[PDB]
């Protein structure tokens, strides 16, 4: 099926405390495999999945230097964005960056993306054509002009279509027994009385992978897909016999229909 | 596999 590698970055400036708090995480589909924390003691990229630990020290050395360069750029960005908007030097601010590449069923390049935010608001983003930037305001238009000067979109386009995809195939291959093995949701139903005439039936979906799943009572109330803590996911949908629990997941050859009994 | 340091500042 389709797969994706995504990287998330967060740098929170702290006035009077020197270096901003830089945190980075990497994902392969709904699985985190690398992390970095500027406040950690190792001061290097650390694995977060068993299969990624098959890489020698040469891999972790280059990834540690590259993630430290990302923090060095976000540090200058926070200082520049403070001047672009003319903000106080005693206030805290946040910059967030995310990018990644997706592949299809043939494991060839499908789409890429890159977004940047400041204080939780959209700042600049790469368009789907991977050749133009969408600027939010005048400060972002200055940045778009700055990036169009050195053709940053051309260099990022070459990474998403080449290096990002090739290493995604290597991650899927080395993580074959986990990244390519779907987990079917273990299903059970619960019944409760909430009114003098109406009741509530809650359909549970637990311990499934990937995270995407659809639960509806078609011819309601459902919460967000939450992590169980062991790599799997959880979700439930409730309603207060014209509609039953329709469970649809990639790990099920046919959808599951359950009714109270 | 992180990309190279080709992104300049803002």
């Amino acid at each position: 099926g389709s797969h994706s590698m995504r990287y998330f970055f967060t740098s929170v400036s702290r006035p009077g405390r020197g270096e901003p708090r830089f945190i980075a995480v990497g994902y392969v589909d709904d699985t985190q495999f690398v992390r970095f924390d500027s406040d950690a003691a190792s001061q290097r990229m650390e694995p977060r999945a068993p299969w990624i630990e098959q890489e020698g020290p040469e891999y972790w050395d280059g990834e540690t230097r590259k993630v430290k360069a990302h923090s060095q750029t976000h540090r200058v960005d926070l200082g520049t964005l403070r001047g672009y908007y003319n903000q106080s030097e005693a206030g805290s601010h946040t910059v967030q960056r995310m990018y990644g590449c997706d592949v299809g069923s043939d494991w060839r390049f499908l789409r890429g993306y890159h977004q940047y935010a400041y204080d939780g608001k959209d700042y600049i983003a790469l368009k789907e054509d991977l050749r133009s930037w969408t600027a939010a305001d005048m400060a972002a238009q200055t940045t778009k002009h700055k990036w169009e000067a050195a053709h940053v979109a051309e260099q990022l386009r070459a990474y998403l279509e080449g290096t990002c995809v090739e290493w995604l195939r290597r991650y899927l291959e080395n993580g074959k027994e986990t990244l390519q093995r779907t987990d079917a949701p273990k299903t059970h139903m619960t019944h409760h009385a909430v009114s003098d005439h109406e009741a509530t039936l809650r359909c549970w979906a637990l311990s499934f992978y990937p995270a995407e799943i659809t639960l509806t009572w078609q011819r309601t109330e459902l919460v967000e897909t939450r992590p169980a803590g062991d790599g799997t996911f959880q979700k439930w949908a409730a309603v207060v016999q014209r509609y039953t629990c329709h469970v649809q997941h990639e790990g099920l050859p046919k959808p599951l229909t359950l009714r109270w009994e | 596999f992180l990309p190279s340091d080709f992104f300049p500042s803002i």
Partner: antibody
Amino acid sequence: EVQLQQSGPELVKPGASVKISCKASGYTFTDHFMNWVRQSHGKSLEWIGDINPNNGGTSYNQKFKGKATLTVDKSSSTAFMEVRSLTSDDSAVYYCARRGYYGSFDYWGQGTTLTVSS
Amino acid sequence: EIVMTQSPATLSLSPGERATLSCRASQGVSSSYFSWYQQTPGQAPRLLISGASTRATGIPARFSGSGSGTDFTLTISSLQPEDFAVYYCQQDYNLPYTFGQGTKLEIKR
């Protein structure tokens, strides 16, 4: 061969305005940003600003916001810089440096000497 | 504004020796946006080394660059008659783009 032909020297009086031209040839003009750099006598270099030759978009050094203005003409492949309200401190050598596709100033003009005196 | 500082101001060496020039940046700069320039008195500057280490088109193989973070270095393998001029460093990494104060290479006699 990339060739940046600039204008000749100019002696002007204070409070006047001069306009330097920079003729580009030997490459695709719309593929590279054009920058402008000033160098005073016995002094180092200072980036004034750049201009996108496709849409005329510009960025400036904060010191030159209101002193120099950048324009381009895609027809003749020429980049212009107009320096207004000239004083004796504006007397220097001005260059137009092409921006490399991925960075740096890969090619420079021969320079244009400006002198502001009464 | 990232400030670039070069050391020393003047460097007296003899034809045929190595030359190591330093450029300290006040802030961390990506090596992909650091450059070296040579300017002979009377002429215009010329790009020598881009990307902290990549040699520009037409620059002799005796010029080599390195460095990272806040410390960059320009190396000349063998000082030749033309290689006695003023050398500048710059950053195109954060607006405004800034240069260094320069470093003159003087013939030692």
